[PDB]
Amino acid sequence: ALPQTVRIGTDTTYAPFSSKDAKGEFIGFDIDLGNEMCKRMQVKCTWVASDFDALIPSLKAKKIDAIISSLSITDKAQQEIAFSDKLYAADSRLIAAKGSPIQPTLESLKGKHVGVLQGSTQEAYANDNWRTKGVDVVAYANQDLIYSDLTAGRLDAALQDEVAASEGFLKQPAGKEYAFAGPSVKDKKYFGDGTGVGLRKDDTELKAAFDKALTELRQDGTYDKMAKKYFDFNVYGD
């Protein structure tokens, strides 16, 4: 009943969770989690690269069978799809040039150019709260474009998952002159409760299989071993 091949869509521009190494192989914590779960589910899995905003449509169209792409578990998303249990926690946070006075507030951001990933919870938040009120919110096909436009000085700030910005950019050579601008942006309704495997609502069996795999690799400590490759903190949360 489970497919012998589970097709998993991911947006490979979100290090350290999902990206590509120099020879084009998919790498990162999402990939590690996905591969470990598939192993324990005893299914073959095929990774499929996609822009983030195409993931849920591809899933609904059955071009893929699952999404592992730091996809936040939100009220809004669950109207369209189902989710596995939580894979890890994910807060949102602004980044900007080091020394910048920028804060995640309308007062600070009005007339500023702020980059967000198209289709993301950050785009939802920024469009509702900031774009309406005169912040130049700029939506991008992928997160790599955002970092590029930031370093080029075309953007004043960018909003994205906190850990991705930190491990994927700030702690990298390209992000040396950048820092977080203000604390995490906390908003329960927009940003959801951690990330999970996104699935078609009727695929209850595939969800059960992922959930079971996830519980097992967390219990035996495999989760923590894989996570320590990327993180010196508790990425899972509570």
Ligand SMILES: N[C@@H](Cc1c[nH]c[nH+]1)C(=O)O
């Ligand atoms: N986790 C957020 C932001 C994100 C973009 N890509 C991966 N994560 C979301 O689900 O929209």
